[PDB]
Design a protein around this nucleic acid. Structure first.
Lengths: 51, 151, 82, 56
RNA sequence: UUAUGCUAUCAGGUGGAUGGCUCGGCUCAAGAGCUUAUGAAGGACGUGCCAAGCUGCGAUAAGCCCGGGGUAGGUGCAUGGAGCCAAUGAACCCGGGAUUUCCGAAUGGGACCUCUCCGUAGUGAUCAUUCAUGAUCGGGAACGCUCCGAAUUGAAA
RNA sequence: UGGAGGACCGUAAACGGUAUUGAUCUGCAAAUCAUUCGUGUGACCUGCGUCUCGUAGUGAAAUGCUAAUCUAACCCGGCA
RNA sequence: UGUUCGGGUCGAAGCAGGGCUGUGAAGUCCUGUGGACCGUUCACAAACGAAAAUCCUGGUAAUAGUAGCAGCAAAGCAGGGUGAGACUCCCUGCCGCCGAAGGGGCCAGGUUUCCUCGGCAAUGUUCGUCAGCCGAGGGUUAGUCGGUCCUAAGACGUACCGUAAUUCGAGUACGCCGAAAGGGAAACAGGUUAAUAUUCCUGUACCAUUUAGCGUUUAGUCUGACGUCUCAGGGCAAGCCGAGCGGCGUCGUCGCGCCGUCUAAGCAGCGAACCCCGUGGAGAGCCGUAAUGGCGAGAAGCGGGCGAAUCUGUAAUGGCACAAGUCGGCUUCACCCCGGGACCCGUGAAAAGGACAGCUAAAUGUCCGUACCGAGAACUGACACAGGUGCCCCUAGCUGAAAAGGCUAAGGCGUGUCGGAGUAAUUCAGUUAAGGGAAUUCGGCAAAUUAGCUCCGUAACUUCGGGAUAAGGAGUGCCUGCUGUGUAGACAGCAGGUCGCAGUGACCAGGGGGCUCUAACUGUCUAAUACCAACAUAGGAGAUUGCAAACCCGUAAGGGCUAG
RNA sequence: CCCUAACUGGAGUCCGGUGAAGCUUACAUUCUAGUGCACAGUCUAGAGACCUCUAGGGGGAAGUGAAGACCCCGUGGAGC
RNA sequence: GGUUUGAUAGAAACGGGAUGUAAGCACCAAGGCAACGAGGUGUUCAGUCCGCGUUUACUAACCAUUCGUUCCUUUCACUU
């Protein structure tokens, strides 16, 4: 239970909601040409350089 | 049944017991699996489908028997002693009880009038100096040398 | 600048209607005083208390407890929740 | 205690925080300076000619 | 039906060379050349009906207003669904405006932190002989001016 | 009686790291594990905070340590 | 590239194979494939020719279906489910692991891993329907818990001054920050969810300012506010025993064993020690303590005041199977209060805040954190890593000095490859071993011996402290009945009977001595080959300097030593 | 140790699943002698040798790991 | 090696062995007012056990597959 401030928690929330797959409708729109994403990650890896 | 693990965890939470204390009826498996909420788990608990198994303690009767024998003074010999004499009976505690007994005896004697102040001072210092083993020894010395103002 | 974004309609948020509380997604810049005054201006109901938390979506949620009975139901009906 | 993986388990803190000015995690928490952009040291942005090669 | 193998070719797999194509790069020439306290550049966070990145934008948030050109489609990279906008002339382009969170020269104080405290609502610092007012601060690919100033190396040391 | 001491024994509390020249040695580990050992009321051990650094610091001093780098760290530049 | 002349969807380049020519560099053609570009004359250019550089980048072999998936730690089995599929997912039972940590709480750190549903291409050292994985949705609520406030070592800003100059530099002045383990205004119990709960709901409280009224200083004091060791008294969480009551277990015989038998803050009441006040007058001395001690500079005794933890009532119609729910006793750490003593050699923080004059009634109490892990799978070491990471002022029964070791609760787990026919040889780690007993070996390395407690007894030498548990001997279990000390808990001791090869029966647990070298000793060290005789140490000696000093840092401004 | 034996658990061995890495110019069933940069599976002359697979300890491949840390040299460095 | 035309393995019983006299019951037991009572004696060379043998088909050695044919074919010594 490390204690974050408002901005630190906001940046963690941004990282969390960035950690999402590309939408299937986006894949359909791009015709399976944008399927990947540079901000995908896992929580148990090299940590965020955000906090 | 699918996983009853969620139901078992919720039931352990509702009963305040450990996870393995929770007993789920192996016949009412679909009845348990239908239970999703705390209220459903409480209903199963009240109707007996879910219950907390009895705690299996540690019985103490065969230690009570040994404690009774040790109170009587048995099962406590040299072959049973393993800590040092001093770890089993602290010397300050021994001295404290001895000196307090002697002091209370002298106080009661001076209160009831068997002991005047002049000899009381010397007897108190003798006791503080360890001349007397116990209240019985003190009384024996008093009766031997006639220190009590008998009447 | 309105602090109230919109009523928050999830299962737990709908559970507030039966205790006369109403949950809102609000501006994270604003505070409890601004949220209370803005809600009172918006719906004409006297607010008894405001509870606020920040989420991991970067949002701020406020549960408002009203003073008038049925005020939460009436605001939900006015919005279109009920 | 080994200077390698054993001593590397004591790494539960930081020497550099996120910089307000540049966003880089380079703000020294002791010297109160950003080693990337110079915030907390100068009103200007920290730049040196040796950050690139001599252009010839 | 001589296995395990060896050599050559053929068919297939893997792989991504070769060829062809290329909205990219590089170099040279000709132009043009400052900007910010009227709060810049840069960063953080937010902003899309389904939207995670980039890009744009700033709680009026892939955008709002006015004039001109353009005119029948539009809704970025990025033709997917469903809608919305557009003959009240949109989209787009040129010019001019508005909005423009927080940090940042950052400038009421503090900042561990991009927030927080007082709220007395904020000319932070240094200056300008009317104390009305005004100047400076940060940024800019290289170029320009002033000052401080090595060693490798060559001399075959 | 009293309860001192850089006192004693001793914990797989903590700290250290003797011997097995054991296991391991493309390891569980870019030095760890098992057994055996030293200190364990003090020049004690340790958290968090803070300060001292490159011809400089720190060092009960081995040229030890200063982010797996130390008889002058690391990054970039002089440098093709 | 200039220039001449051309070829191509009736199939260019490229690619695989082949025919012919040329000594050759190479050219041309044929077949297939391919789908849009390609050549040629004379000249001109170059980022122009690869088999090599422990060459670079990419791809991919042999090794090879091999090593590994074996110390963690006894690891699973039966039955029934689910599912297309089950050693591996779910339930029940049995059998097991940890049980002073592998459980509980939480710092830093992580950052959604938390909860629910749906999946199994990858991850998981096997599988997988499972999951910290994948996809979708949800979840963190505070005046009272922290931050926030205060200041600590010590930073940062402004000014001055220095500097060629600065974003550089010491000092001074003014500010400002600096502790989620220092100080600190205040909240408890129960319930509720799938996930939050001193935060939401119920009940019962409390604190701060501000406003209005009612009254006002005692003002400058006290508190906050303090080291190490040791000890007394009181209390208490936990623990234990007896009786009643209510369940469960056992039931071959017996009647035992286990669980429960509850109750917060707030409010009201009492107050132990210390201290103080009034009396008193105590010596051929009296009064005390565990101990030190106290006393005509006023003891004992007698009255009073001040003053704790805790306890008592109330908070009572809360939760419990609306099942009981009532009582006593013992002990009490490792927690709370209080007091004493010893040491100096570190003499052991500051400031905010609070108290001393407040009572009543309304309003206000913003902001941030709050899920979950906190580690043999949620941190860090590239990993679901046998390391490391704050630890707890956390831990139940028996044995026992004990938190050692063993066996068990509660709680957490069987969580990280299987099977297996002698499962050969060999190997890692263990048990035992005739007779000999260091003959082995560089060397008793390794292993073995001894081992607890009680009693007897204990040498040379010595700095008189020690050596010392020296050495060397004896006892030890169980049962029956007792004695002594003590308020008690308990402790010590005695008499008799008795079994075994063996009574500290397992667990735990020194082998000892003699003669030398060396360093006095405790301590420090080559993190990752050197724990030593090396370094340090106390002790001894020498040197400089009277302070605008000696010595040293800085270019300077000015500093360290030096609050000397 | 004379002088080893038996046994226990984990590996190994055999089976199911999963599944790397390191040596490699080529060929390769070798052995003796000679030759050769004087230390040859490949040269020369002999002698052997049917192939494949499994287990096993390591004789050899001057086995692998590594631009020798010993010595010298370099008008190469570093510290003292 | 055996495979019902059978003692190959197992069960049962017995022989031959290992250990040391089971549980319960009764009497005694130092003593205790009693409740109890370590232990002794009899029951009892008992109880428990046998990875050995014998006897004995009581269950299981059953049911089968496969080669000894190059396979398809009538390139046949065959048959719808």
């Amino acid at each position: 239970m490390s204690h974050n401030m408002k901005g630190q928690k906001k940046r963690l929330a941004k990282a969390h909601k960035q950690n999402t797959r590309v939408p299937v409708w986006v894949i359909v729109k791009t015709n399976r040409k944008v399927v990947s994403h540079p901000r995908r990650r896992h929580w148990r890896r090299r940590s965020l350089d955000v906090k | 049944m699918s996983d009853l693990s969620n139901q078992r965890k919720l039931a352990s939470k509702v009963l305040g017991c450990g996870l393995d204390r929770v007993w789920l009826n192996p016949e009412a498996s679909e009845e348990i699996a239908s239970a999703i909420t705390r209220e459903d788990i409480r209903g199963l608990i009240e109707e007996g489908t879910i219950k907390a198994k009895p705690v299996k303690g540690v019985s103490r009767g065969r230690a009570r028997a040994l404690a009774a024998k040790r109170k009587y003074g048995h099962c406590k010999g040299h072959g049973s002693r393993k800590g040092k004499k001093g770890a089993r009976t602290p010397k300050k505690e021994q001295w404290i009880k001895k000196i307090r007994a002697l002091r209370r005896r002298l106080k009661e004697l001076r209160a009831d009038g068997a002991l005047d102040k002049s000899v009381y001072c010397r007897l108190y210092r003798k006791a503080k100096g360890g001349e007397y083993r116990s209240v019985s020894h003190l009384n024996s010395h008093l009766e031997s040398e006639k220190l009590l103002k008998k009447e | 600048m309105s602090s109230i974004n919109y009523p928050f309609v999830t299962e737990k948020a709908m559970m507030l209607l039966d205790e006369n509380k109403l949950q809102f997604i609000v501006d994270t810049r604003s505070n409890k005083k601004q949220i209370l005054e803005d809600v009172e201006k918006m719906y004409g109901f006297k607010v008894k208390s405001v509870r606020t938390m920040t989420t991991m979506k970067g949002m701020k949620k406020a549960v408002l407890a009203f003073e008038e009975p049925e005020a939460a139901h009436e605001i939900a009906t006015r919005i279109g929740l009920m | 205690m080994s200077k390698g993986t054993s001593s590397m388990g004591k790494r539960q803190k930081r020497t550099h925080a996120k910089c307000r000015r540049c966003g880089s995690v380079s703000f020294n928490v002791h010297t109160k300076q950003c080693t990337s952009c110079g915030f907390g040291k100068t009103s200007r942005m920290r730049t040196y000619k040796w950050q690139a090669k001599c252009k010839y």
